[PDB]
Amino acid sequence: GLFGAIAGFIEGGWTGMIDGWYGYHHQNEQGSGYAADQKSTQNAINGITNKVNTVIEKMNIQFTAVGKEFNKLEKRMENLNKKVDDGFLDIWTYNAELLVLLENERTLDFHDSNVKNLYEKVKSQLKNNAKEIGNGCFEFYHKCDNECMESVRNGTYDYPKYSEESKLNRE
Amino acid sequence: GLFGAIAGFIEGGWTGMIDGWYGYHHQNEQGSGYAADQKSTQNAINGITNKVNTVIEKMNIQFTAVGKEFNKLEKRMENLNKKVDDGFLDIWTYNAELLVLLENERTLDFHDSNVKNLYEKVKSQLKNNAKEIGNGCFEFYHKCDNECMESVRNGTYDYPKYSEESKLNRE
Amino acid sequence: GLFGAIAGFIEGGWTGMIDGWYGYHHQNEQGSGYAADQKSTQNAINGITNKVNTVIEKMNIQFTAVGKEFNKLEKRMENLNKKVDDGFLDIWTYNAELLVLLENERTLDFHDSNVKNLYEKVKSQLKNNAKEIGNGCFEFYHKCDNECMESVRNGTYDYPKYSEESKLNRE
Amino acid sequence: XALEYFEWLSX
Amino acid sequence: XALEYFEWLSX
Amino acid sequence: XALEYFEWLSX
Amino acid sequence: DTICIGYHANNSTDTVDTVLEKNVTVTHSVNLLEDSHNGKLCRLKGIAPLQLGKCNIAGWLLGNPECDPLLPVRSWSYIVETPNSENGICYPGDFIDYEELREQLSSVSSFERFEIFPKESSWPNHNTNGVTAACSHEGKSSFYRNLLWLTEKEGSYPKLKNSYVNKKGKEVLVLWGIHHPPNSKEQQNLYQNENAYVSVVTSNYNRRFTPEIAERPKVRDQAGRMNYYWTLLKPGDTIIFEANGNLIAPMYAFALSRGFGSGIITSNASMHECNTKCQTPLGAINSSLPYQNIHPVTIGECPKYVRSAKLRMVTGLRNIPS
Amino acid sequence: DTICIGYHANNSTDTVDTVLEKNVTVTHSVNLLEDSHNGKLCRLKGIAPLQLGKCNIAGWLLGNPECDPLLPVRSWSYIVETPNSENGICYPGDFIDYEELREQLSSVSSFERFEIFPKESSWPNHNTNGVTAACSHEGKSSFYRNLLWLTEKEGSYPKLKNSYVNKKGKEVLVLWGIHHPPNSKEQQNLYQNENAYVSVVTSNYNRRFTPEIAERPKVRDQAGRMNYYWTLLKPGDTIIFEANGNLIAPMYAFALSRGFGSGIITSNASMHECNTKCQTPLGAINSSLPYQNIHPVTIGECPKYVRSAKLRMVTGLRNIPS
Amino acid sequence: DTICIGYHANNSTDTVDTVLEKNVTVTHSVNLLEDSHNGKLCRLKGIAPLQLGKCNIAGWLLGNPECDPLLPVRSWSYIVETPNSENGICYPGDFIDYEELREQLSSVSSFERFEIFPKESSWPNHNTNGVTAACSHEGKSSFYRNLLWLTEKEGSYPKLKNSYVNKKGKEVLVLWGIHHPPNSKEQQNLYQNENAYVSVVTSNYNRRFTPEIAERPKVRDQAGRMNYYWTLLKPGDTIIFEANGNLIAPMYAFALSRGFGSGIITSNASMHECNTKCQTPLGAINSSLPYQNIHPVTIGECPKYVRSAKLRMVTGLRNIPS
Ligand SMILES: *[C@@H]1O[C@H](CO)[C@@H](O[C@@H]2O[C@H](CO)[C@@H](O)[C@H](O)[C@H]2NC(C)=O)[C@H](O)[C@H]1NC(C)=O
Ligand SMILES: *[C@@H]1O[C@H](CO)[C@@H](O[C@@H]2O[C@H](CO)[C@@H](O)[C@H](O)[C@H]2NC(C)=O)[C@H](O)[C@H]1NC(C)=O
Ligand SMILES: *[C@@H]1O[C@H](CO)[C@@H](O[C@@H]2O[C@H](CO)[C@@H](O)[C@H](O)[C@H]2NC(C)=O)[C@H](O)[C@H]1NC(C)=O
Ligand SMILES: *[C@@H]1O[C@H](CO)[C@@H](O)[C@H](O)[C@H]1NC(C)=O
Ligand SMILES: *[C@@H]1O[C@H](CO)[C@@H](O)[C@H](O)[C@H]1NC(C)=O
Ligand SMILES: *[C@@H]1O[C@H](CO)[C@@H](O)[C@H](O)[C@H]1NC(C)=O
Ligand SMILES: *[C@@H]1O[C@H](CO)[C@@H](O)[C@H](O)[C@H]1NC(C)=O
Ligand SMILES: *[C@@H]1O[C@H](CO)[C@@H](O)[C@H](O)[C@H]1NC(C)=O
Ligand SMILES: *[C@@H]1O[C@H](CO)[C@@H](O)[C@H](O)[C@H]1NC(C)=O
Ligand SMILES: *[C@@H]1O[C@H](CO)[C@@H](O)[C@H](O)[C@H]1NC(C)=O
Ligand SMILES: *[C@@H]1O[C@H](CO)[C@@H](O)[C@H](O)[C@H]1NC(C)=O
Ligand SMILES: *[C@@H]1O[C@H](CO)[C@@H](O)[C@H](O)[C@H]1NC(C)=O
Ligand SMILES: *[C@@H]1O[C@H](CO)[C@@H](O)[C@H](O)[C@H]1NC(C)=O
Ligand SMILES: *[C@@H]1O[C@H](CO)[C@@H](O)[C@H](O)[C@H]1NC(C)=O
Ligand SMILES: *[C@@H]1O[C@H](CO)[C@@H](O)[C@H](O)[C@H]1NC(C)=O
Ligand SMILES: [Cl-]
Ligand SMILES: [Cl-]
Ligand SMILES: [Cl-]
Ligand SMILES: [Cl-]
Ligand SMILES: [Cl-]
Ligand SMILES: [Cl-]
C-alpha cells in the first residue's frame, strides 16, 4: 500500500467487522468486540459512489449505429468507413481499460490512506496514556471501560482524566 | 484529504495569512503573528504552474475547420462525415473533462501532502523541547523569542541550545 | 516528494548501495557497510514491471496503413480522409504523452512511499532503544552487532533483549 | 448507482 | 501562464 | 519486458 | 485493556486489475461491462421491427413474387435482413444507387404501398401481361408486383406519356426499370422500335434512357438485362414518364415517413414477444452499464461497444481475511 | 509560547469538481473553457472576409442580377453566406459538381473577374441579347452577368468554335451552361437545330453535351432546364468551346489565387471594424484558453470545441475559513 | 552504533518529464519511442516487394514500353513507386476509376501476366500493327505491350466480336482502351466508320462507348485522346468485346491473387538483402517499442505513429548522488 497501513503494519483484515469498511476492536474487563467507524466509512462510501457514478456519467448513451454498404467501385470509401469505425473502437477500448486501471489503483490507495488516518487519529487522541504494541493496536496504561472506549471512538477522549493513573502505571 | 492534514488534524485555514499557501503562526512574550513559508509555497507554485501550462500545451491550436455539403445522392458520405465530427467531439469532450477531474484530485492531494510535510519538518526539528497540543500546534517547554521562532521557520533550530531548559520544565 | 522521504528528510541517495533501490547503512564496532533490502526492492520491481508492460500491452500492433489517392473531382473525400488521419494522430499523440507524464509522477511518488514505509518499519521495530538523529538515521542506545543489525533488517528485532541496556544508557 | 453495502448508510 | 498570487513569487 | 537491474532479482 | 484499528474483510472472490498489480482480490466491486443478451429480436420502445425474412431490400421494394406480401401500411423501429436472403433482384440487371437507397430507408419509420399507376387504365394501347421465368412464382412465370412490363399491342407501341401528382403530403418513393434486350430482333418483337427512349422527369429529377443491345452471358438463364432506377417525389411535386419502348413502368409506389433511431441490420434471431431499449443482431440488451462487448452494431439506446473482455472497478478494499 | 503550522484561506467562492467529490470551494482556480464571443464578424489576421450577403456561391459565381456587383478584384480570409440566401440559381437546372466547387473555393484567397469571351466580337453570326423573366432584375427580364445566352440570328445558327489561352499565370475558373428546352418547337425557334451538340475541351477536361427535350413541371414558371458546368483551366492551358446550339457561353471567368486557413461559413452577424485570430458564425473569439463551447465551426487559430459547460482547474487549496 | 535507511543512486543522466516537474534526472528509465530506421527497402516476412522503378501503376498495367519488362508471374508483400515516376500514361487520355484500381491492387499479393487475346489470330480482317511516337521506345514509335491498336485493313473495318472465358480459377483484371481522334478525317482513315461503337460486357459489367471527335490542345504532341477502362472478371465468367472501330483491344490480362497486409508506398530507398516485420518509405523498423515518430505510412507489424519527439518512462528513482 502507498500509505503502508493495509497489508502493511496492519497485516490483515477483520471478517468479524461486518458493519463497515474501517473500525475498531476493543477488549477490557467488560469484554471484547468490534465496532465500525461510521464517519470515515460514510465519507469513503460517498467518495467512491461519486467515482463510479462519474465514470458511468462520462460515457454517453450510444445511440443507433449501423453499418453501410458500398458497390464494387467504392472500395476506398468502404475502407475509409472501416478505418473510422476501427479507430474509434481502438480509442474507446483503450480509454475504458486505462481509466478502470487508474481508478482502481487510486481506490486502493484511498482506502489505505483512510485506515492510516484513522490510526493516526486514535494515536493522537491517546498519548503516553497508551503504548503502540504494533499491528495497529494500542495498550492502555489505565482501565478503559466501554464509556472510555466510546470516547476514543467518537473523538472525545479525555486525556487528563486518565493522565494521572496512566502516569502511575507507566512509571 | 489523502494525507489527513488539510481538513484533517489541521481543521481550518488561515485568512490571516495572506502572503502564502503554507506557513506559520507564532505567539511569545514579544507578541503573536503569521508568517508564510516561502520555500514550500514557491515549490508548489512552480509545480502547479507546470501542471496548468502542460495541460494547455497538450491541446494544440485548432486551425480552420468548417462543414461540407453533399447532394441528395450522397447521404452515406454525409453521415460518414457527421460520424467523424461527432466521434472526435465525443472523445475530446471526454478527455478534457476527465483530465480536469484527475488533475484536480491530484492537486488537492498535493497541497495536503505539502502541509503535512511542513508539519513533520517542524515536528522533527523540535523534539522533547515542545509538545503537540493538536490542531497542528506546538507548545514550547522553553522561552522562544522571535529569533528562536525564525530559527524554527528557516530550518536552523538549535535543539541543544534549549535542551537543558526544556528538560527542566518538562520534568 | 509526495511523502517527503526522497529529497526530503532523507536528502540524498547512496551510490555506495549498488545492489538495490532501497536499503540500509550500518556502523558498529565490527565496522560499517551498505545492505539493500531485497523484499521492498523486489516488490517495487514487480509493480513497475507490471506498469511498463501494461503500457506497452495497451498499445496494439499497428498493422498496414497506407495513403489513398483521389482525382480532381474528389477534394471533399480527400479532405475527409485527411481529417480522419489527422484527428487520430492528434488523439494518439495526446494519449501517449499524457499517459507517460502521469505514470512518471505516480512512479516517483511510489518510490518515495516505499522509502518512507521502510523508514517507518525500522522506526516501529526500534523504539526507545534508539533515537532519531535525522537524515533517516537511528542511533542505538545499546551495542548492536552484525546479528542485531540483521535482526533489524529482516524484521525480527528483539526489543526486550536490549531494552534493559538501552534503558540504562538512555537514563 | 448506490452502494448499499451496509444497513446504516445514508443512499 | 503565470500564477501571480503573491508578491514575492519569483514568475 | 524485464527489468534486470540487479543480479538477484527473480525476472 | 486494549483497542485496535482495522479494516473490513469478507469472503469475496472478486478480482480487479491495477497498474502496479494485476489480479487483486477485493471485498466489493462493480462490473461496468455488459456481456449478456437474450438472443431474441424484440420491440424497440414498443415498436416492432420490419422483418423482410426471405428477401432483401431490393426484392421487397421491387415486389419479388416469392416474398410473402406485406400489409399495405407498415411502421417499424428498425429493418431486419437475414443472411439467408436469396430473393432479391430476380431478373438480372443493375440497381442504380441501391446503397444510397438503403441509406435513405435507414431513416424511414413507415411506408404506405399504394397504386400510383393503375394497371387496367393507365397505359392504353399497350400490353401489360408480360412475365418471365426468372421471376418464377409457384413454378409458373411471373413478374414484380410493384412494376409492370409494358409490351407492344397489336403490332404497335405508341409513344406513351403519363404523370402523377403527389398529394400524399409526404415523400413518395417511385421505382421503375429499363429493359435491355440481348438482340435487335427481340427489341422489335417487344417494343417495335429500334430508336426507343425513356424519359423520367420531376422538379429536381431528370433522366433519359437509351436501350443498349448486346449479347451477354447467361444470368439466371437470361441474356438480356434490366436496370432499376428510383427517385423520391417531393410533396406536391409531379413525376412524368414518357416512353416509346423498353420501359418497366411503375405500378406501386411508397409513401414514406421519416423517423429517428432506425437502421438496417442482418440478424439470425427470431421475433419474440418482448421489449427492449437496445437491440443487437445477436439479441437484445437490457442494461444500464456503460460498456458492452456483445456487438458493434446497435439500435436504440445502448452501451458503448469495446473489445474488452473485462472491465471491473473496485469499490471496496483489498480483501485479506488471513 | 507556541508555534503553529497552517495553510492559506480566503473569501474565494470558486468551485471545482474532483473524482471523489464534486463542488469543492477553493482559494485559487483557473478557467480553461472559453464561453465568450463578441457577436461580430471581424477581420482575420488583418484580412476582411468575402460577404455574399443576399446571394450564395452559385448566384455569385453565375452572376445573378439581383446581387450587388462586387469589385473586379477581391481578396478575403473566409467566405460568408447568410441563411437568408434567396438568390442563387435563378433559372431552374442542375449545378454539376457544385459541392466540389464549394470545396475548391474553400481554399481560394482571392479572385479576379475578367472578360474571357468579350460580348460584342466573339460569337459572330449569333444573337447575344437573350434574357428571361426567371432572372428578373428591377422588374424587367435579365440574365447572368458572367454568362451569355447565344441564340439564332437571321434564321441560322452556324457552328461556332472559340477558344481561350490562359496567360493569367494562375488557375482560371470557367463556368458555362447547357439549355434544355421543354419542346422541339422552342428548340428550333432558338437554335434552329434538332441534332445540336456542345463540346468543351482542355488539356485535362473533355465533355460533350446533347440537349434533352421533354416537358417538365414548372419551376419559377419555367418548363425548360439549364444545367451548369465548370472547370479549372491550368496556367498556360487552352479551353475550347464548339457548339451548334443550346450553349450558354461564358463571358466572365475567374482568376483564382490559392491560400490557407480559409473556409465557408453561414452567419447571421454583421461586419464590424474589428480584428481577431479566431472567428465563429456566432462571433469572434479573443482568447488563449485551450477549450471553447461556443461553436464547432471555427476559422483561424481557435480553441478546441467541446460540449462541456464547465472546465475549471484548481490551482490553490481547499478554502476553509471556518 | 547507528543504522540508516536510504535509497539507490548512480551516475545516470537520463531525464524524464512529469506533470509537476519537467526534466528530472532518474536512476533507471525506459524509452518507448522508436526513432531509428535502417534507410533500406527490405523483405516483409520473407517476401520481397514489387518495385515498379521508373514507372507507376498505370504504366506498369498498361504495358509502357520504357518500363523494364517484369517476369510473367510475380508475388510481393507491398508495391513501391518512386517519386521519379515519369513513365505512366504515355498516350494522352483519362484513366477511368484509376484510384479505385490502385485500391484494388493494394490487396493483391501476386499476378500472372497471360495472353487473353493472342495477337496473330484473334482479330482477323483487322490490322494490329498500329504504333505511335507518344509511346516511343528506343527512339522509334511503339505502343503498350498489354494493349493492341486495331486499325482498318484493306479499306474496311468489319464488326468484330470476340470473347474470353476465365478458367484461371481467380480474378482476371482486363484492361482496354477507347480512341478519340481529333478529326473525322482521321476517324475514317483509321476505322472507316463515323458511327462506330464499342461494347464490353460480362455477367456484372456492362458498358458501351461512342467516339467523341473534337480538336483538342496538344498533349505530348497528340491532339487526340485515349480513355482507359478496366474490369475484374470473376472466376468462370465470360467477357465479351464487340466493336466496329476505336477499340484498343486487350492482349495481356492479369490473373490476380488476394492477400493481406499489403499496400502501395512512394519511396526513395533501394532494395537490400535484409528482412523486417515493419517497413516505412524512409526505411525498415526493427523494434518492439509501442510508438514511433519515423513515418505515418507503415506496412507490416509496426509501432503506432505519433508526433512526439520524446516518450521516456521512468522506472527507477530520482537520482540524487549529492
Ligand atoms: C461521545 O462519547 C462520549 C463518551 O461516550 C459521550 O459522553 C458520554 O456521553 C453520555 C451520553 O450518553 C454521558 O451521559 C456520559 O456521562 C458521557 N461520558 C462522560 C465522559 O461523561 C458523548 O455523549 C458522545 N457524543 C459525542 C457527540 O461526543
Ligand atoms: C536562519 O535563521 C537563523 C535564526 O534567525 C538566523 O540566525 C541568526 O542569524 C542572524 C543574522 O541575521 C544572526 O545575527 C543571529 O545571531 C542568528 N541567531 C543565532 C542563533 O545566532 C540565520 O541567519 C538565518 N539564515 C539561514 C539561512 O539560516
Ligand atoms: C533473520 O535474522 C535473525 C537475526 O540474524 C536470524 O536469527 C538469527 O538466525 C541465525 C540463523 O543463521 C541464528 O543462528 C542466530 O542465533 C539468530 N540470532 C538470534 C537472535 O538468535 C534469523 O535466522 C533470520 N531469518 C528470519 C527469516 O528471520
Ligand atoms: C460469502 O459471503 C456472502 C456475503 O457477501 C454470503 O452471502 C455467502 O453465503 C458466503 N459464502 C460462503 C461460502 O462463505
Ligand atoms: C489470481 O489470484 C487468484 C487468487 O489467489 C489466484 O487463484 C490465481 O492463481 C491468480 N492468477 C494469476 C494468473 O495471478
Ligand atoms: C445464426 O448464424 C450463425 C452464423 O453467424 C450460425 O452459426 C448459426 O447457426 C445461426 N443460427 C440460427 C438459429 O440461425
Ligand atoms: C431489465 O433488467 C432489470 C434488472 O433486473 C429489471 O429490473 C427489468 O425488469 C428488466 N426489464 C425487462 C423489460 O425485462
Ligand atoms: C474577497 O477577496 C478578494 C481578494 O481575492 C477581494 O478583492 C474582495 O474585496 C473580497 N470581497 C469580499 C466581499 O470579501
Ligand atoms: C456546492 O457547494 C456550495 C458551497 O457551499 C453550496 O452553496 C451548494 O449548495 C453546493 N451545491 C451542490 C449541489 O452540492
Ligand atoms: C440570427 O439567427 C438566429 C437563428 O439562428 C435567429 O434566432 C436570430 O434572430 C438571427 N439574428 C439576426 C440578427 O439575424
Ligand atoms: C483580447 O483580449 C486581451 C485580454 O484583455 C487583450 O489584452 C487584448 O487587447 C484583446 N485584443 C483585442 C484586439 O481586443
Ligand atoms: C556510469 O555508470 C554506468 C553503470 O550504469 C557505468 O557502466 C559507467 O562506466 C559509468 N560511467 C561513468 C563515467 O561513471
Ligand atoms: C535539465 O536538467 C539538467 C540536469 O541538471 C540540466 O543540465 C539542464 O540545464 C536542465 N534543462 C532545463 C531546460 O531545465
Ligand atoms: C530521397 O528523397 C528526398 C526527398 O524526400 C531527397 O531529399 C533525397 O535526396 C532523396 N534521396 C535519394 C537517395 O534519392
Ligand atoms: C532486430 O534487433 C534486435 C535487437 O538487437 C536483434 O535482436 C535482432 O537480431 C534484430 N533483427 C534483425 C533481423 O536484424
Ligand atoms: Cl471497539
Ligand atoms: Cl510565525
Ligand atoms: Cl546495513
Ligand atoms: Cl405495422
Ligand atoms: Cl478586397
Ligand atoms: Cl516473385
Q: Which residue in E has a C-alpha nearest to residue H27's C-alpha?
A: E5
All structural domains of chain C with their residue ranges: 1-171
Chain H residues close to I225, C-beta within 8 Å? 206
Inspect the interface and report whether the beta carbons of A20 and D1 lie closer than 8 Å. Answer: no
Closest CA of chain C from H17, distance in Å: 19
Ligand 9 pocket mutation pick from H23, H29, H312 by most atoms within 8 angstroms of CB: H23
Nearest to C84 among B54, B70, B84 (CB): B84
Q: Could you say which DSSP state residue G234 is in?
A: P
- Are H168 and H215 contacting, i.e. CB atoms less than 8 angstroms apart? no
I158 Cβ contact list (under 8 Å, min separation 6): I125, I126, I244
- Are I104 and A75 contacting, i.e. CB atoms less than 8 angstroms apart? yes
Task: Name the phi and psi angles at C77, rounded to 5.
Answer: -65, -40
CB of C79 within 8 Å of a chain B CB? The answer is yes
- Kindly give the pairing relationship between strand G41-44 and strand G271-276: parallel
CA distances from A122 to C45, C124, G140, G317, H315 (A): 34, 17, 94, 21, 32
Ligand 4 atom 8 nearest Cα: G11
Ligand 3 atom 4 nearest Cα: C151
Ligand 13 contact via I23 beta carbon (within 6 Å): yes
H320 Cβ contact list (under 8 Å, min separation 6): B6, B7, B11, B12, B13, H9
Residue G15 CA to ligand 5 center (angstroms) comes to 9
Chain breaks in chain I (C to N over 2.5 A) after: none
Task: Name the phi and psi angles at H230, rounded to 5.
Answer: -150, 160
From the centroid of its chain, how far is CA I116? 22
Q: Which residue in F has a C-alpha nearest to residue I30's C-alpha?
A: F3
Chains touching D by CB (3 or more pairs below 8 Å)? A, G
Nearest to C138 among I2, I262, I307 (CB): I2
- Kindly give the pairing relationship between strand H171-180 and strand H247-250: antiparallel
- Kindly give the pairing relationship between strand H73-75 and strand H41-44: unpaired
- Are G61 and G96 contacting, i.e. CB atoms less than 8 angstroms apart? no
CA neighbor of H247 nearest in space, from H157, H172, H185: H157
CA angle (B77 as vertex; B75, B79 as ends), nearest 5: 65
Ligand 8 pocket mutation pick from H10, H11, H12, H28 by most atoms within 8 angstroms of CB: H11
Chains touching E by CB (3 or more pairs below 8 Å)? B, H
- Euclidean distance between CA atoms A121 and A125, whole angstroms: 6
Ligand 8 atom 2 nearest Cα: H11
Residues facing residue G24 across a β-bridge:
G16
Burial class of residue G101 (count of CB atoms within 10 Å of its CB; 0-12, 13-18, 19+): buried
DSSP three-state, residue G158: coil
CA neighbor of B159 nearest in space, from A124, C137, C132, A128: C132
All structural domains of chain I with their residue ranges: 1-41+273-322, 42-272
Q: Could you say which DSSP state residue I139 is in?
A: T
- Euclidean distance between CA atoms B91 and B99, whole angstroms: 12
- Are G84 and G121 contacting, i.e. CB atoms less than 8 angstroms apart? no
Residue C66 CA to ligand 15 center (angstroms) comes to 25
Return the number of other C-beta atoms located less than 10 Å from residue G8's C-beta. Answer: 27
- Are F11 and F4 contacting, i.e. CB atoms less than 8 angstroms apart? yes
- Euclidean distance between CA atoms B30 and G131, whole angstroms: 115
- Are H24 and H18 contacting, i.e. CB atoms less than 8 angstroms apart? yes
Q: Which three cell numbers stand for residue H184?
A: 422541339
Chain length of chain I: 322
Residue H78 CA to ligand 20 center (angstroms) comes to 12
What is the SS3 assignment for C61-114? CECCECCCCCCCCCHHHHHHHHHHHHHHHHHHHHHHHHHHHHHHHHHHHHHHHH
- Are G64 and G87 contacting, i.e. CB atoms less than 8 angstroms apart? yes
Q: Using the structure block, give the residue that is written with the C-alpha cell 472526435.
A: B88
Half-sphere exposure of I76 (CA within 13 A, CB side): 24
Residue B151 CA to ligand 2 center (angstroms) comes to 7
Q: Could you say which DSSP state residue I252 is in?
A: E
Residue H108 CA to ligand 8 center (angstroms) comes to 52
Ligand 2 pocket mutation pick from B125, B154, B159, B161 by most atoms within 8 angstroms of CB: B154
Method by which the coordinates were obtained: X-ray
Nearest to B69 among H4, H8, H102 (CB): H102
Q: Which amino acid does the sequence have at G121?
A: S
DSSP three-state, residue A170: helix
DSSP three-state, residue G4: strand
CB of I129 within 8 Å of a chain A CB? The answer is no
Can chain A be said to touch chain B, i.e. do they have 3 or more Cβ pairs within 8 angstroms? yes
Ligand 12 contact via I10 beta carbon (within 6 Å): yes
Tell me the ligand closest to H13's alpha carbon: 9
Half-sphere exposure of B53 (CA within 13 A, CB side): 14
Identify the helix (H) or strand (E) that includes residue H148: strand H147-149
- Euclidean distance between CA atoms B76 and G104, whole angstroms: 9
Q: How many Å is the Cα radius of gyration of chain F?
A: 6
Q: Which three cell numbers stand for residue G141?
A: 412465370
Inspect the interface and report whether the beta carbons of A72 and I97 lie closer than 8 Å. Answer: no
Inspect the interface and report whether the beta carbons of I20 and B103 lie closer than 8 Å. Answer: no
Inspect the interface and report whether the beta carbons of B94 and A121 lie closer than 8 Å. Answer: no
- Euclidean distance between CA atoms G195 and G176, whole angstroms: 20
Q: Which three cell numbers stand for residue C144?
A: 548492536
Chain H residues close to G313, C-beta within 8 Å? none
Q: Which three cell numbers stand for residue I199?
A: 461494347
CA neighbor of B64 nearest in space, from H302, H95, H220, H314: H302
Return the number of other C-beta atoms located less than 10 Å from residue C70's C-beta. Answer: 16
Ligand 12 atom 1 nearest Cα: I11
Inspect the interface and report whether the beta carbons of H203 and I217 lie closer than 8 Å. Answer: yes
- Euclidean distance between CA atoms H263 and H241, whole angstroms: 32
- Euclidean distance between CA atoms G73 and B36, whole angstroms: 80
Question: Which atom of ligand 4 is closest in space to residue G10's alpha carbon?
Answer: 2
CB of A60 within 8 Å of a chain B CB? The answer is yes
DSSP three-state, residue I107: coil
Out of 3.80.10.10, 3.40.50.2300, 3.90.20.10, 1.20.1250.20, the CATH code matching C1-171 is 3.90.20.10
Residues facing residue A86 across a β-bridge:
none
Residue G286 CA to ligand 19 center (angstroms) comes to 24
Residues facing residue G75 across a β-bridge:
G110
Inspect the interface and report whether the beta carbons of I30 and F5 lie closer than 8 Å. Answer: no
Ligand 3 pocket mutation pick from C38, C156, C161 by most atoms within 8 angstroms of CB: C156
- Euclidean distance between CA atoms H288 and H304, whole angstroms: 11
Q: Could you say which DSSP state residue I61 is in?
A: H
**What CATH number is given for I1-41+273-322 in this structure?**
2.10.77.10
- Euclidean distance between CA atoms A59 and B146, whole angstroms: 57
Chain G residues close to D5, C-beta within 8 Å? 28, 316
G42-53 exposure pattern, b = at least 16 Cβ within 10 A, e = fewer: bbbeebbbbbbe
Can chain D be said to touch chain G, i.e. do they have 3 or more Cβ pairs within 8 angstroms? yes
Residue A157 CA to ligand 1 center (angstroms) comes to 10
CA distances from A27 to A122, A132, A138, E11, H159 (A): 16, 15, 11, 58, 116
Chain breaks in chain H (C to N over 2.5 A) after: none
I116 Cβ contact list (under 8 Å, min separation 6): I164, I172, I174, I250, I251, I252, I253
Residue A133 CA to ligand 3 center (angstroms) comes to 22
Chain H residues close to G199, C-beta within 8 Å? 212, 214
List residues near ligand 3 (CB under 6 A). C 147, 150-151, 154, 156, 158
Task: Name the phi and psi angles at G109, rounded to 5.
Answer: -100, -20
- Kindly give the pairing relationship between strand G171-180 and strand H291-292: unpaired
**What CATH number is given for H42-272 in this structure?**
3.90.209.20
- Euclidean distance between CA atoms H158 and G40, whole angstroms: 72
Closest CA of chain F from C38, distance in Å: 8
Q: Which amino acid does the sequence have at I51?
A: Q
Ligand 3 atom 14 nearest Cα: C147
Q: Which three cell numbers stand for residue I147?
A: 494493349
End-to-end, the C-alpha distance of chain B in Å comes to: 37
- Kindly give the pairing relationship between strand I264-266 and strand I79-81: parallel
CA neighbor of A155 nearest in space, from A47, A24, A46: A24
- Euclidean distance between CA atoms B49 and I27, whole angstroms: 26
CA neighbor of B142 nearest in space, from H2, H44, G59, G110: H2
A86 Cβ contact list (under 8 Å, min separation 6): none
What is the SS3 assignment for B46-92? HHHHHHHHHHHHHCCCECCECCCCCCCCCHHHHHHHHHHHHHHHHHH
CB of G52 within 8 Å of a chain A CB? The answer is no
Q: Could you say which DSSP state residue D4 is in?
A: -
Inspect the interface and report whether the beta carbons of C45 and F1 lie closer than 8 Å. Answer: no
- Euclidean distance between CA atoms I240 and I234, whole angstroms: 13
What is the SS3 assignment for A37-87? CHHHHHHHHHHHHHHHHHHHHHCCCECCECCCCCCCCCHHHHHHHHHHHHH
Can chain I be said to touch chain C, i.e. do they have 3 or more Cβ pairs within 8 angstroms? yes
Q: Which three cell numbers stand for residue H319?
A: 478554502
Burial class of residue A53 (count of CB atoms within 10 Å of its CB; 0-12, 13-18, 19+): middle
G106-131 exposure pattern, b = at least 16 Cβ within 10 A, e = fewer: bbbbbbbbeebbeeeebbeebebebe
CB of C91 within 8 Å of a chain A CB? The answer is yes
Residues facing residue I283 across a β-bridge:
I280
Task: Name the phi and psi angles at A150, rounded to 5.
Answer: -60, -40
Q: Which three cell numbers stand for residue C3?
A: 511523502
Identify the helix (H) or strand (E) that includes residue B114: helix B75-125
Question: Which atom of ligand 5 is closest in space to residue G22's alpha carbon?
Answer: 14
CA neighbor of H189 nearest in space, from H153, H160, H159, H217: H153
Cβ contacts of A6-9, under 8 Å, gap ≥ 24: A6/A108, A6/A111, A6/A112, A6/A115, A6/G7, A6/G317, A6/G318, A6/G320, A7/G318, A7/G320, A8/A112, A8/C117, A9/A134, A9/A135, A9/A136, A9/C120, A9/C121, A9/C124
Identify the helix (H) or strand (E) that includes residue I29: strand I29-31
CA neighbor of C42 nearest in space, from C34, C31, C50: C50
Return the number of other C-beta atoms located less than 10 Å from residue C12's C-beta. Answer: 15
G103 Cβ contact list (under 8 Å, min separation 6): A68, B75, B76, B79
- Are G34 and G287 contacting, i.e. CB atoms less than 8 angstroms apart? yes
- Euclidean distance between CA atoms C119 and B14, whole angstroms: 32
- Are H20 and B105 contacting, i.e. CB atoms less than 8 angstroms apart? yes
Inspect the interface and report whether the beta carbons of G30 and D1 lie closer than 8 Å. Answer: yes
Q: Which three cell numbers stand for residue B5?
A: 492534514
